[PDB]
Amino acid sequence: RPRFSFSIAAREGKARTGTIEMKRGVIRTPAFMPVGTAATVKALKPETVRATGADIILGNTYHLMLRPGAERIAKLGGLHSFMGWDRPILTDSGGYQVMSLSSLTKQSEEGVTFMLSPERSIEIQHLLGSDIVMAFDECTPYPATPSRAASSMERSMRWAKRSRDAFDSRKEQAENAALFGIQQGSVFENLRQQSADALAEIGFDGYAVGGLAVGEGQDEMFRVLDFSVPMLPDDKPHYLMGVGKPDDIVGAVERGIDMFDCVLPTRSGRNGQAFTWDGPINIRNARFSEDLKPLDSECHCAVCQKWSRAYIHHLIRAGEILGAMLMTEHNIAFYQQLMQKIRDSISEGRFSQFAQDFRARYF
Amino acid sequence: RPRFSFSIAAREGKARTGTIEMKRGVIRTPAFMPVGTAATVKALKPETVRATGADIILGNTYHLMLRPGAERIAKLGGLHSFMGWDRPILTDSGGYQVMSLSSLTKQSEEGVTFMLSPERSIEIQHLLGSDIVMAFDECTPYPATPSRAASSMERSMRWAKRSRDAFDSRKEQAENAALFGIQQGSVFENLRQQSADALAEIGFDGYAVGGLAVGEGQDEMFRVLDFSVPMLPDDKPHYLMGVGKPDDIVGAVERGIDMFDCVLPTRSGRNGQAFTWDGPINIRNARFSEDLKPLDSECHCAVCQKWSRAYIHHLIRAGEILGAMLMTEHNIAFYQQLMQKIRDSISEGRFSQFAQDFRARYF
C-alpha cells in the first residue's frame, strides 16, 4: 500500500464515504477511532478491538511520554509491537492533556513546560511509531473572546508550520507516516477561514476541526461545522477531534466529517452506560435486574450474542472487571456498527433517510 | 454421559490420574478449578477460562445467595446460563465465607444466622444449578484444641447426614448432580479417622479434605494429608479445598489428592504476581520495565504468545484493566499446564521424577 491515499467512493450532500490506504492497513471512512489511553483501549485486547470492526485506534501521547516514556517505547520496538495492534494508529500531539492533567504549566511561543514543543511532539509521535501524526497546537478554551481566539489560532498556525517542517526533516517518518493539521478559531467564521487558508497553504495529508469538543452544545457545534468544513480541502480527510455521541457523529458526517474519536464508548461503558438503537441505557438501574434480553436487540456483537442485561447489571453493580470488559466491547461494537450503517447508506444514496430514521428511534 | 462416574486410568504411588464423567462434561484429574466469585472468574470471559484448559470451575455460594440471590438466578435460568459457562460447576456450601465476610454471626445446631442451614445450603446450590454440591459444614479454626476440633467435626458429621438427606429428597438434584462430603478433624489423626468413617458410612460421590487451607504451613499440611487421605474411599475423588500454591498441589497429588481450587492464580495475578517454571515473579518490579521476554519462556498461553513482560509491567503499574486480564489468563493457563504435566507424568509412570525436577527449578 502507499504511504497515504484517501479516495472518495460515494457522496450524498456534504457526506462522503471512502477509504484511506496506509502502509499498515486500510481505513474505511467515515471512521470511528477507539481511544487507547496508556497504550491500551481500556478493558479490551487488541484482537477484540479489531473484532468490533475498528480499522484504526487513537493513541494518547501525553500519558505515554510520561509513562512508560517515548524513548523507552521506541527502544522496545514501537507502540504497535508494544501493545499488540498492528494496524494504523493516530496519535494526538499531547499538548491538550498537558493543559488538563498537569500543573504549573508555562506556555510560550516555544511551546509548553509542565518542555513540550512542536518539534518534540512530532519527535515523540515518531518514536511511538505513529501512522497519523497530529500537528502540535493549542485547543482554544470555550468560550473565547475574538481577540483570544485569534491569538491562539495564529500561534497554532505558526506551530503548524513548525510541525510540518519537523515532520519533513525526518526521512523515515515523512516516508511512512502522514501528518494532519488542525483548524482552530473557536466559533468565529473569519478565524476559521484564516486558519483553513493557513493550513492549506502549508499543506497536510488531512485536516482536523479542532476546538469543538469543549461543551458548546450540539446546536453550536453544528452551526460552526456548517461553515468550517467547507473551508477545508475537499479531497483530504476531515477529522472532528473528540466528538463521539452517536447523534453528534451522524450530524457531523452530514456536514462533511470523515473521522471521529472520543472516550464516550469506553469510559461510559465502564460507568454503566450502554448504547442501543433506542437510545442509551444505564445498566445499573434496577429495572434490568431480571431482564434476559441482550444490551441491544439488534446488535451483532459477541456480548449481545451471549449475555443478558441481567448478568451485566449484576457484574457492574458488583464492581467486577468482566462488567467493564463486556460493556466496553458492546459499546465499541455499537459505534462501529453505526459507522458501517453510515458508510453503506451513503454508498447507497439513502444516508439522509438513515439519519432521519436513526434520530426518530434513538430519541 | 452418566450423572457421575470417576474412573482411575493410571497410578504411581499414592498419585492417581483419571476422569470424572458428568452430564455437563468430563473432568480430567488431578484437576484445578478456577474460582468464580460472584458468578465470574475475575477478569476472564468463560471462553477464555475454557481456553486455558479448565474442565470445571468453582462457584462461590455465599456471594450469590446475597447478590444477585439464589431464587433470582434460578428464575433467570441457573448459574450456567447466567454466566455463560456450560460445563461442570462445583459450588461451596457458603458456610465458610459466612464466618469470614459477615457479622453478628450466631451459630447453633440448626445452622448459622448472619439462617443458613444444611438444608438451605443444599437448596441454594440446587437453585444455582450446581453439578457438584458440597455438604454444609464448619471449617474448624487453626489452631484448635482437641476438644474444640472434635466438637466441630462431630457437628459437621451430623450436618453431613442432613446434607445427604436434603440432597436425596430432591429428585431433580439427586439425579443430575453429585454430592461431596467433607472430612474435618483439624490436624488430629483420630478425629480425621472418625470423620472419614462417618462420611463413608453415609456415602458420598466424592470426599473433600477440609480445614487445611488455614495457614498451618506446608510441612504440617503434608503431614496431615499423609494419614488423612488414605482413610477416604479409594475409588472416589479426593478434593483438597482451598489449596493451590504450585508446590502445594504437586505434594498433595503425591499424597492422593484429585481436585484443587484456590484464588491464588486469579487474585495474585491482579496483584502483579505471575507464575513461571522458575518460580513466581512480581511483574511490578523495575527489572521488568524493558524486559521483552514473555511472562514465562515455555508457557503456551495466548498472553505469552503475544505480549512482553515490559508491556504487562506497564499495564499493572498503570492500574489498567488489561493488566489484570492478561496476568489472570496467564496464571490460570500456567496452573492448567501444571495439572496437564502432572496427569501425563502419572500416566507415564514418571510423576515422581517430574515432582523432583519441578521443585529443583521452581525453587
Ligand SMILES: [Zn+2]
Ligand atoms: Zn452488543
Ligand SMILES: [Zn+2]
Ligand atoms: Zn503464559
